[PDB]
Amino acid sequence: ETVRIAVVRARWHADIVDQCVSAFEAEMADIGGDRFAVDVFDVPGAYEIPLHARTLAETGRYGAVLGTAFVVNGGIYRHEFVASAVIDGMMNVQLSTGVPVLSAVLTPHNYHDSAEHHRFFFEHFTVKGKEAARACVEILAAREKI
Amino acid sequence: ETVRIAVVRARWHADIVDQCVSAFEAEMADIGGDRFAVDVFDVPGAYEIPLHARTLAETGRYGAVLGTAFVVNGGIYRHEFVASAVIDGMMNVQLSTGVPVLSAVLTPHNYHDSAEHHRFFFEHFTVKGKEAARACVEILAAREKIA
Amino acid sequence: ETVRIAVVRARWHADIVDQCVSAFEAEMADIGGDRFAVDVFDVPGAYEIPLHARTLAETGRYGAVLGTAFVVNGGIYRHEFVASAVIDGMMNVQLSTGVPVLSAVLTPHNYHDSAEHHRFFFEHFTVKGKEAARACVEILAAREKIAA
Amino acid sequence: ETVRIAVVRARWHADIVDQCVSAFEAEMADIGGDRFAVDVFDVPGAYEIPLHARTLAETGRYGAVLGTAFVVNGGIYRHEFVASAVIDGMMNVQLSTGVPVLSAVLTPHNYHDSAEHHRFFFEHFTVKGKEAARACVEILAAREKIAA
Amino acid sequence: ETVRIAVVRARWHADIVDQCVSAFEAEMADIGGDRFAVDVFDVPGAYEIPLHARTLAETGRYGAVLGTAFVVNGGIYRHEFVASAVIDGMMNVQLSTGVPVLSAVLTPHNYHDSAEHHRFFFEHFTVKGKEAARACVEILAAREKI
Amino acid sequence: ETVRIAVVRARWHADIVDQCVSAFEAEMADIGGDRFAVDVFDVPGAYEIPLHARTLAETGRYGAVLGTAFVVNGGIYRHEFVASAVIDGMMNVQLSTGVPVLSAVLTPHNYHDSAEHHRFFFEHFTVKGKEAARACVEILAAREKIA
Amino acid sequence: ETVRIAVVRARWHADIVDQCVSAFEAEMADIGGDRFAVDVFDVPGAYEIPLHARTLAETGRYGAVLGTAFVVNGGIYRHEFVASAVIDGMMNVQLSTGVPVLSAVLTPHNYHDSAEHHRFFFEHFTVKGKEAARACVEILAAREKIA
Amino acid sequence: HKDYETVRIAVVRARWHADIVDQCVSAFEAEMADIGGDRFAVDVFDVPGAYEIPLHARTLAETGRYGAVLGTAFVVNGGIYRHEFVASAVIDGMMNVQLSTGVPVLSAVLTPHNYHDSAEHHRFFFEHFTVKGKEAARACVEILAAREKI
Amino acid sequence: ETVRIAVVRARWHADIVDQCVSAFEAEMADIGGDRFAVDVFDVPGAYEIPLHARTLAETGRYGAVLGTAFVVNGGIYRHEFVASAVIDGMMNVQLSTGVPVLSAVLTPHNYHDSAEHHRFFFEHFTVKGKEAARACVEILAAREKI
Amino acid sequence: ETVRIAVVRARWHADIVDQCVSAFEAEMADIGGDRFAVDVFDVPGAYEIPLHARTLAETGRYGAVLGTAFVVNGGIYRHEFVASAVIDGMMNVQLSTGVPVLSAVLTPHNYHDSAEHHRFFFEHFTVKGKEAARACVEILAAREKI
Numbered sequence A, E, I, J: 001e002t003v004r005i006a007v008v009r010a011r012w013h014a015d016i017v018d019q020c021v022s023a024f025e026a027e028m029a030d031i032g033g034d035r036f037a038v039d040v041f042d043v044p045g046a047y048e049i050p051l052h053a054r055t056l057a058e059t060g061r062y063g064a065v066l067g068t069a070f071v072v073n074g075g076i077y078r079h080e081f082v083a084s085a086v087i088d089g090m091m092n093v094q095l096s097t098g099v100p101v102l103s104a105v106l107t108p109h110n111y112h113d114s115a116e117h118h119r120f121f122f123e124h125f126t127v128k129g130k131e132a133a134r135a136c137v138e139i140l141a142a143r144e145k146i
Numbered sequence B, F, G: 001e002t003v004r005i006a007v008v009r010a011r012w013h014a015d016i017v018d019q020c021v022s023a024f025e026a027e028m029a030d031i032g033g034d035r036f037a038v039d040v041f042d043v044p045g046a047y048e049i050p051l052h053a054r055t056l057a058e059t060g061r062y063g064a065v066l067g068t069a070f071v072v073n074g075g076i077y078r079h080e081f082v083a084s085a086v087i088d089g090m091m092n093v094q095l096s097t098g099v100p101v102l103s104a105v106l107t108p109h110n111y112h113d114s115a116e117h118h119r120f121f122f123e124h125f126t127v128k129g130k131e132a133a134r135a136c137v138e139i140l141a142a143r144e145k146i147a
Numbered sequence C, D: 001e002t003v004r005i006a007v008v009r010a011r012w013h014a015d016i017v018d019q020c021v022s023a024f025e026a027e028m029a030d031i032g033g034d035r036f037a038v039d040v041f042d043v044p045g046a047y048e049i050p051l052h053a054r055t056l057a058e059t060g061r062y063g064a065v066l067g068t069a070f071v072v073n074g075g076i077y078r079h080e081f082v083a084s085a086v087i088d089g090m091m092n093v094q095l096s097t098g099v100p101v102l103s104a105v106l107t108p109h110n111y112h113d114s115a116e117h118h119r120f121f122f123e124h125f126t127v128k129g130k131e132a133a134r135a136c137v138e139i140l141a142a143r144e145k146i147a148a
Numbered sequence H: 001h002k003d004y005e006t007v008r009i010a011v012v013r014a015r016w017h018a019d020i021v022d023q024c025v026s027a028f029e030a031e032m033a034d035i036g037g038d039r040f041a042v043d044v045f046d047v048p049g050a051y052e053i054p055l056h057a058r059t060l061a062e063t064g065r066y067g068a069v070l071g072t073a074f075v076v077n078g079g080i081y082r083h084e085f086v087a088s089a090v091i092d093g094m095m096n097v098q099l100s101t102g103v104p105v106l107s108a109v110l111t112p113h114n115y116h117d118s119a120e121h122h123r124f125f126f127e128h129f130t131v132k133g134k135e136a137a138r139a140c141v142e143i144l145a146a147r148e149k150i
């Protein structure tokens, strides 16, 4: 059977987020055999991830939902409220829909979009993207065992 | 196709808040294709945004809602609770009604009601107000992409 | 046609809290008076507000409730967990009842129950109390505008 | 008729959490004679309080549930997420069942297991226990005034 | 009759999480005799525990579920949002299903994966496993008295 | 006989700072009565106090020196360093010159240029001045006891 | 040949402070008796302690000096700068003078002058006073055993 | 002698964020001229970073050619290393200098709460620094005036 | 040619502190022997270290002075003021007298008097003792290369 | 005629500290070869830098001194006290001796000895070495202008 996995990515810091989405989309598709299928959906910001995962999840056409974004402190406004709301949101959604939802919504201790700062998280996100895909495979598999 | 967007704006720091609401409507007009009509509703403070956003969402007349407020650390009482309750409340509202609720409820690191602070944000809210418009047009259309 | 407002006031630092309450009724009467009526109920502390607000809310007899308390850090136990539950609580109550719940539940950055401190908030609560009255009238008048 | 109150006490720092329970029962009988009865139930830790309370509340046997526990920072792991999910839990339970749930789940700013620290709180939880009795008696009296 | 306990253990820092798991099974079978039986389930991260616990809880085969993971600040991203939502998630899962969910989802003040830390927790997690065991046997007994 | 006390005040938040000074002068007179004489000197801000105070103490013309300023977090720059450099600074000057230097350089937890904050501290400062006046008289009387 | 120890106590919260001073004297006479003598000196607040410790020290009549005070965050202004400047200043004094300076200048994590707090430190300062007593005797002996 | 004399003011400006720092420098000279005019003269000295200001301010100060020295730098938190220790050492160091040399050293070394090298951040401080420069000037003129009264 | 090192140890938490002292003496011999000799001096608490280190340095019999103590957060009073004064104090002392003053005055992020914490540091202090042994030897060697 | 610069480098995280030293040397030779000579001295830890720099400064042999170290929070002890006494110390040293003392004693926000952290700072220190070089040349030239 072909399991559909949806990726809901924010477009803020698209540059870095996409490094996670591509890495993720590779581990998922590359284990090719029509096993999994990755549909990617655009979302303005992290705050827009929960409701989108829910609507997607409620179609019953997906075995899992990945939420991904980079939620940082830009120096002017505080980012914790939104970060908190999104992480708690995806938890509420999956418990609600019974559809697993993995979190690739990251918040670093520091991010000044400096040349060095940008380089780093741009490369570490591919790492996290790979992590998420292998965790996705594992959770679905761990569910058959129930 | 015609779409109605309701804006729920608080009146604390109306001054600054309104800069976002108007920047919101203008942007909405440009990148909208004349598809959107916008109704604005006045609410005392940020804490009054979730319940109002929900009541509006339930009418079924709107496509999305934009809550916008300036919740700051006034230096006398703590603002996190209210700030959190409001951002948590709006997430809560869109999940239960299925109606998108965008946040323009901002809390800065520092706002001491000085000429510099007041001016800065009076200016920046125009930037956010525009960001909110794009977010609104983007998610609505994104949702049209879900079969 | 009279519209009632319920005021759930905690009894901790009653001195300071009541100044918010009588500043609420006076302002309420002054800006609306004739059109509104205010009933006041006592609760041990702020933690007991959400439930009371919900009960008063579910009687259908009220157009809105005002939650008001003074939740401080007394230097022994942490207060953030309670204050947090009361604020999310009132949001939780108003969202499922549909009845507006205004918040006058305040937590100061610092309050050591000293003459100057006590004196400061005793005075300031009447100011917040007057802010609550306007807020209450406005949200009720604002809802009146929604073409529900 | 006699009103039943369920005390759900935690077994962590049992020694301290009990000065509260013991004081709560004393004051309860002190200001209610035969009007109330107290049933004490044991629970492993603070995190088990919410479900137990919701379960006890749902038997319709109790007029209120008192949750009590000492959730300190052991200096090894972080205690906030627990303290927080428990105060939120007790609020979640009371709003859903409709039964008052008072909090005696205190978190100090500091507790290092020093003899001094233990002595202080061993004593102070008695103060809290007494406060919990008044709260419990009053809240219930307060709901009666509500022409539900 | 026999009561079955389900364990949901995250694989992050698995090496440490497993000292607690094996100390739980050991302590359980010890203080409970042939009264209980334990079933272990593997989850990628701490964030997958709530939904797994709810799903396991909804099979009506377990009298309780134990979630166990090590959620730490790795010095790159903020960890409190996930921690926060796991502890809330389990509390939410137990309140809705009625099945107790004991928590062994620990978060230390400091963990730098040095030699000192890694050893301290590899060891202390055994202590926690015993504690979770007694907690489990105790709460189920406390409920029988209602 | 009379004793000279020198007051070095910053001109930042002069409004508030002067309530401490006038209060200091009042208390100085009420409990000291013609025994003490107060000379006031202006300085741009708190950072200039240590040197001015030292220079004064070195004239050997004052029994003691008071330093007073309102050092706050205006919400844009960090105030700690300066407040700290000045509290240690005054310590530095009195330990080396041998002349007592009393501190009325206060830093509030919060101050936001809101009526509430301004009024509170404008009012409270006369209290701090009163204390410094008493501390001033007391420290000198004590030094007297050191045989 | 009697050894005199000079205790310099602040007067803020004198209530609690005097408990440390009295316990210090008791213990000091218990494990010493006729070997040491205690002279107490009153000072306005903690900030005035370092200079008084120095003056006293420089008379060469004291084998050591004990500066004790209660320095709490009263909720309005910040108390770290003054504590810091007092604890550091005493260190400055003993290093430049060679006269040991023991500290009983405590700053609690939390103090609201409520019934319970007051009682807690009113008692505890007794413990501290006896500790300072032992520390005082030991240090002088440890130095006695150095070329 | 009587005052028909010129007082020299030396400015020790850091070069990190030269852009922003410079705005404080020009506004200082302008203000200075505006109120001081002919009774003061300003010499500007470049320095690598804020940490180098104290020793430089001290060498200048000890030549005796200046009535006051103004140290100016922009010590920010780049998000990688902590800037507190340096900022604190530079602020304490100057105080150290002025007390030892006796020559007034005014501080224009600022550490903002949040600086993330962005358009608005940069623009905010590029503008605000002129405000701080004018303040530095009035402070410099006044402190010197105030001393003359002693 | 026997260089003498003086150790100033606080008697507060004397138990945990002495594990650094003895570790220091063994490593010193293990890598010095004949070359250096250690002399131990007891002081009431940390705050008394600076003045003692000075007095010792000034006798001119020692090539280096080691200051050691455990300065923790007691949950009742703030400890930073005293720690800060001692680290600065020893620095102050070495720059004036010219005798190197090494630091084994440690402050743990968290230390509650419990068996777990007490054991950790009772054990970790020997590590610091050996580190301090090699530091002392190396600094004295490096100064000769000048 | 040749001006000599002295470098006092700590040996903690030597691997990383040395990146700054070599980068420094290579830049010091690149922007003014022959005019400057760099002498490197080893010290155990950052806390040893002030005294060493002072002794090296007091010989009149050097036109300046560079202190370099990596002072991090290891999750057990607080590092603020040493970092501060070392940064204040070098300032205290250059004001008394008059000899310039540049600072390369860095303290990061987060360092957890791991693949990514060590990598990031290992390379970044090259950037900090070059920066210290320019500052060295520039400050000595700035002084000539007096």
Ligand SMILES: O=c1[nH]c(NC[C@H](O)[C@H](O)[C@H](O)CO)c([N+](=O)[O-])c(=O)[nH]1
Residues within 6 Å of the ligand: A010, A011, A012, A044, A045, A046, A047, A048, A069, A070, A071, A072, A073, A074, A079, A082, B101, B102, B103, B104, B132, B135
């Ligand atoms: O995805 C992100 N969105 C952000 N925007 C907030 C939110 O996601 C929505 O776009 C909008 O606020 C209302 O819908 C961020 N910040 O503001 O910092 C961020 O860091 N990351």
Ligand SMILES: O=c1[nH]c(NC[C@H](O)[C@H](O)[C@H](O)CO)c([N+](=O)[O-])c(=O)[nH]1
Residues within 6 Å of the ligand: B010, B011, B012, B044, B045, B046, B047, B048, B069, B070, B071, B072, B073, B074, B079, B082, C101, C102, C103, C104, C132, C135
């Ligand atoms: O919109 C805001 N409302 C505020 N008022 C709080 C709340 O929104 C309600 O007006 C009232 O509290 C009762 O409902 C604010 N502060 O108090 O600081 C603020 O910053 N912003």
Ligand SMILES: O=c1[nH]c(NC[C@H](O)[C@H](O)[C@H](O)CO)c([N+](=O)[O-])c(=O)[nH]1
Residues within 6 Å of the ligand: D010, D011, D012, D044, D045, D046, D047, D048, D069, D070, D071, D072, D073, D074, D079, D082, E101, E102, E103, E104, E132, E135
């Ligand atoms: O009541 C408490 N329970 C504690 N345990 C947490 C929880 O209540 C459960 O016992 C167990 O975690 C499994 O659910 C505590 N600490 O861990 O520190 C504490 O201080 N107090």
Ligand SMILES: O=c1[nH]c(NC[C@H](O)[C@H](O)[C@H](O)CO)c([N+](=O)[O-])c(=O)[nH]1
Residues within 6 Å of the ligand: C010, C011, C012, C044, C045, C046, C047, C048, C069, C070, C071, C072, C073, C074, C079, C082, D101, D102, D103, D104, D132, D135
């Ligand atoms: O209203 C308040 N209630 C308080 N008590 C908490 C709660 O409101 C209940 O009285 C009790 O906890 C049991 O329900 C407070 N403190 O404890 O500090 C406080 O400051 N204010």
Ligand SMILES: O=c1[nH]c(NC[C@H](O)[C@H](O)[C@H](O)CO)c([N+](=O)[O-])c(=O)[nH]1
Residues within 6 Å of the ligand: A101, A102, A103, A104, A132, A135, E010, E011, E012, E044, E045, E046, E047, E048, E069, E070, E071, E072, E073, E074, E079, E082
């Ligand atoms: O169990 C853990 N999982 C972690 N991963 C988070 C989450 O559990 C999932 O694996 C993944 O995020 C997608 O759902 C952790 N950190 O990230 O730090 C951690 O410390 N512990």
Ligand SMILES: O=c1[nH]c(NC[C@H](O)[C@H](O)[C@H](O)CO)c([N+](=O)[O-])c(=O)[nH]1
Residues within 6 Å of the ligand: F010, F011, F012, F044, F045, F046, F047, F048, F069, F070, F071, F072, F073, F074, F079, F082, H105, H106, H107, H108, H136, H139
């Ligand atoms: O006395 C003060 N001076 C201030 N200026 C700093 C300093 O006192 C000098 O005026 C100037 O920095 C250069 O000498 C302040 N702020 O900047 O915020 C302040 O709050 N209080």
Ligand SMILES: O=c1[nH]c(NC[C@H](O)[C@H](O)[C@H](O)CO)c([N+](=O)[O-])c(=O)[nH]1
Residues within 6 Å of the ligand: F101, F102, F103, F104, F132, F135, G010, G011, G012, G044, G045, G046, G047, G048, G069, G070, G071, G072, G073, G074, G079, G082
């Ligand atoms: O002894 C104290 N003195 C205090 N006064 C400060 C200082 O000791 C002097 O009395 C006065 O500031 C001028 O010399 C305190 N506070 O201000 O908070 C305090 O807590 N304790």
Ligand SMILES: O=c1[nH]c(NC[C@H](O)[C@H](O)[C@H](O)CO)c([N+](=O)[O-])c(=O)[nH]1
Residues within 6 Å of the ligand: H014, H015, H016, H048, H049, H050, H051, H052, H073, H074, H075, H076, H077, H078, H083, H086, J101, J102, J103, J104, J132, J135
């Ligand atoms: O003037 C500054 N110098 C800086 N460099 C530090 C120092 O001023 C010297 O240039 C160098 O460290 C050697 O002394 C800064 N930061 O590092 O962030 C800064 O923000 N501002």
Ligand SMILES: O=c1[nH]c(NC[C@H](O)[C@H](O)[C@H](O)CO)c([N+](=O)[O-])c(=O)[nH]1
Residues within 6 Å of the ligand: G101, G102, G103, G104, G132, G135, I010, I011, I012, I044, I045, I046, I047, I048, I069, I070, I071, I072, I073, I074, I079, I082
């Ligand atoms: O060495 C220590 N001394 C301590 N005492 C302080 C000081 O060192 C002196 O013994 C005494 O205070 C008089 O100077 C400590 N605490 O108080 O917590 C501590 O942790 N460690």
Ligand SMILES: O=c1[nH]c(NC[C@H](O)[C@H](O)[C@H](O)CO)c([N+](=O)[O-])c(=O)[nH]1
Residues within 6 Å of the ligand: I101, I102, I103, I104, I132, I135, J010, J011, J012, J044, J045, J046, J047, J048, J069, J070, J071, J072, J073, J074, J079, J082
């Ligand atoms: O140079 C460093 N030295 C360190 N040790 C302190 C000091 O440098 C000496 O080695 C020793 O303390 C004796 O003086 C460090 N830590 O402890 O973490 C560190 O990060 N960096």
